[PDB]
Structures are given as structure tokens and as C-alpha cells.
Curated annotation (Swiss-Prot), chains A, B, C:
Residues that span the membrane, as ranges: none
Name the UniProt record assigns to this protein: Paraneoplastic antigen Ma2 homolog
Membership in a protein family: Belongs to the PNMA family.
Superkingdom in the source lineage: Eukaryota
Tissue: Expressed in the cerebrum, cerebellum and testis.
Residues included from the entire protein: 157 to 336 of 365
Length: 180, 180, 180
């Protein structure tokens, strides 16, 4: 009889021309694995609740996969989705895509350093960057790739020379304080 | 028979078109209160020595106030002067006139920060600014209101982060050392 | 029967229009004094080995000096060379030639500060600068005489206020780290 808290299913589609409602695949797989492993419901409704989150090309893959094997488990479907849509980067290509990444022509700089920190985690999980130098490659890649103002650059240059280097949180604090 | 030194009387007139010889009223009252309280001679001599420091519109007020009551004391005259010329500012208007005060189009920044400190003392005696944040509002109002850049901005922004904040004297030293 | 690693003789000529192969006189005298004092052979071999390092006007002086006194020692020849080519500076002129020395129109600033330290040593040898202020006159002459801006100016300005002043080596390290 009360109001009820609806909550939005995370939609995925796999098109490059993605709509604003649609996630990157790595986020969708974190939902689909919950439906696969954690929910208690039988496999026939797991399949449906996975399928009801898909749209466009990604839904076509679910149809292809199920039609080519009607006995398939949801776990084996998610292996097919990992194989088609999961990112195939190597140690070489993840270092390159990280180091190639500069501040975009429309970005404010505090968005750039936050965007950049996700690529560092991507590269560290590939073992393409050692954890013990992550701070160095943060400051260096920010200072290489950002459109820095002089008064920020002095404070970043000081911090690079300081001895103990910034956390990502402190680097964001310093950059945010110069966004004005 | 020796040389002799006449330390000059502080002249006041109350006109907006004040001549270079003429004090702000708040300074003249500090002289007139000396002649009122401290000097030993009778009220008739005090009246004349007060009047001899007044000129133009402020002298006209002394004539009005005396003519409407010849029995008046010099102390009671200075209450009339406080009422007509003494600064009428409220708590808000002292903060607003402080925060509105930017570096003038012909000022060097080393003059501006000293001009500005007098307005802070004005606002503190109104209890409009808490004494314990005076240093913050110095650095902030300097950095907001002055025409500085780059090399000086770095040292001031550094000092804002340094822990214990500058005295007015040290802030003046830093700004003067960049006037060159 | 083996390769031999012969090392080039330091040629000197004393012309203002010096060729790229030719040393300044102070470096040549440091070789000629070795041939005078340290080599074992007689004066008649010393004279020839000194003369074989000279060219043009400096060789003409060796001929003049020997012809006007064939009894002369190699040491007394080098006294004639010190008298004709050795620099005749004074406390006044060495301070001026140092403080007048700015960064050249084609120089990198890291080359300029190294050139500048040689002039400081020149001045200290004439007692024209006290050794205990050499650090101040480095930072001040760099900051006055270089072409500078932005992050390096801020770092140099900080270092002037830092307490213990830079060595020349550290001042070079700082300037080189901003040459990029």
C-alpha cells in the first residue's frame, strides 16, 4: 500500500553508438555474474533476467548462443560474452593506451585525472605497471597530458620533488583547488 | 632665541572635495579629544583651540552648535561632530565595503595590502569579522582583489597551505619583494 | 707492432680570431709550465717543445723573445708570455665583467649558469668576491642575468628563501630539470 523503491536494471548493448542508458560491458558483467551465481532462482529464470538486461547486438549474441546450444548454463553464456565483448588488451597495448591518454579539448582537468586513474588500475591488473611506481606515473602522466596552468604546475613540480609522493585523492584535491 | 619647532595643527573641513592638508574626521577627533580632555586651560580656551583646527563646512557646524547653545562644553560639541561626521557603518556594510575593496587602477599591490589592513581593523572593531580568522581574510581578499600573477601567486598560495598563516608584516614583505 | 693512443698537443695562437683547434691562453700556460718544470729533458728540448705548441702571433712572440736574448730560460719565456697574454683584470673590472654577464641570445640557461661559475672563480681568485657570499651572487646573477619565467623562477625564488643556499651542482640540477 506504500510507495515502493524501483531500481534501474543496468542495460547493455555492445554497439559502439551506445545510448546514454547503456553501460560499458565490464559493469554489466558484474550484474550478470550476480544473476548467474548469487540469486537463488532456477536457471530458466536466470536466463530470462540476464536476457532482459540486453539490447541490440548483445541480445543477438544471447539468441545465437542459446539457439546453437539450448542446454547451455548461464555461466557458459557469460564466457561467450567475455569472449565477444571482454577487453583483449596486452601489457604493451595497455601501457600505450595509458601513456597516450591526454586531457580532452572539452575536459576540465579534475575530470581528466579521475579518468586517467581508471586506466592505471586497468594496467596494474594486467601487471603492465608495478604498484610500487603508480604514484610516479600518475604525476608524470598528468604533467605530460594535462593543459596545466603555471600556478598548478609549480605545486605539482614541488610535489614531484617532495620525497613522499601524492595519493590520487591528494592529487585531485590539489587540482580541484585550481579548477576555479 | 634658538630655532623653534611648530609641529603643525591637524586641520579638518568635512568637505568631500578635501584638500591635501586636511585629515579624515576619525584622525581629527583624536586631536580634538586631546584638546577636550587633556589640556589644562578653561572651556573658553578649548573652544577656540578646537575651532582654530576646523575649516569650511566643519567650521560652520561649530558656529551652528555654539550659536544654538553658548553654554555647551567642548565634550558636548564633539558629540555633535561624532553625530554629523563620525562613520555610520553597520556590521554587514563593513564586511561588504571590505570585500568590495580591490586594488586600484593606479596602485602598486604593496600599497593595496596596507590600505586593505585598515579596513580589516575597521570591520574587527565593529565585531563584523572574528579576530581569529583575520589572516585567512587577508590572504583571500588580497588574492581575490589584487592584480598579482604567477610567481607571487605561487608564494601566497604556498603560504595559504603552509600551516601557520602570515602576519600582515610578513605578507607585506613577500608582496614588496615582488614589486621589483 | 700495436695501435698507439697518442693525445693531441694543446695549440695556442693569441689571435682574437682564434681557430676552433686553439685554446685560451690560461689552458695553454698550464701545459707550457709542465714542459718548463716537470719534463726531464734539457732547456734546448724544452724551448722546441714549447715553440711547437705555438702558432701565428703567439709564435712570433717566441721568436722575438729568443732573438732579443738567446740566453733566456723557458721559465723566463713564459714570464714574457704571462706579461703579453695573461689577463690584467682588477677588483673593479672583474666584479663588473661578472655582474654584466647575462645569458647570450642563443644560450640554453643550463649552459649560461656553467659559464657564469667560471667567472665567479675568476673573481674569487682576484679577491673581488668573498667566498662566503658566492652562493648568493650565483642565485642573484642567475635570476638577474638569465632569461627566465614561470616554474623555474618560482623554484629559484623559493631556493633563495630556503635557508641554506644551493651548491652550483644543485643549481645546475634544478635548471637542467626545467630545460625540457
Amino acid at each position: 500500500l506504500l510507495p515502493v523503491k524501483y531500481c534501474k536494471m543496468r542495460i547493455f548493448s555492445g554497439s559502439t553508438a551506445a545510448a546514454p542508458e547503456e553501460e560499458p560491458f565490464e559493469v554489466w558483467l558484474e550484474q550478470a555474474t550476480e544473476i548467474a551465481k548469487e540469486w537463488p532462482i532456477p536457471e530458466a529464470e536466470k536466463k530470462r533476467w540476464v536476457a532482459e538486461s540486453l539490447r541490440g547486438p548483445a541480445l543477438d549474441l544471447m539468441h545465437i548462443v542459446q539457439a546453437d546450444n539450448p542446454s547451455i548454463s548461464v555461466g557458459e553464456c557469460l564466457e561467450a560474452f567475455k569472449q565477444v565483448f571482454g577487453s583483449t588488451e596486452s601489457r604493451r597495448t595497455s601501457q600505450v593506451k595509458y601513456l597516450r591518454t591526454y586531457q580532452q579539448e572539452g575536459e576540465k582537468i579534475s575530470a581528466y585525472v579521475l579518468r586517467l586513474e581508471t586506466l592505471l588500475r586497468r594496467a596494474v591488473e594486467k601487471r603492465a605497471i608495478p604498484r610500487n611506481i603508480a604514484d610516479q606515473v600518475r604525476l608524470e602522466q598528468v604533467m605530460a597530458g594535462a593543459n596545466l596552468g603555471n600556478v598548478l604546475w609549480c605545486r605539482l613540480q614541488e610535489l614531484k620533488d617532495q620525497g613522499p609522493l601524492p595519493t590520487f585523492l591528494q592529487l585531485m584535491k590539489v587540482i580541484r583547488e585550481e579548477e576555479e
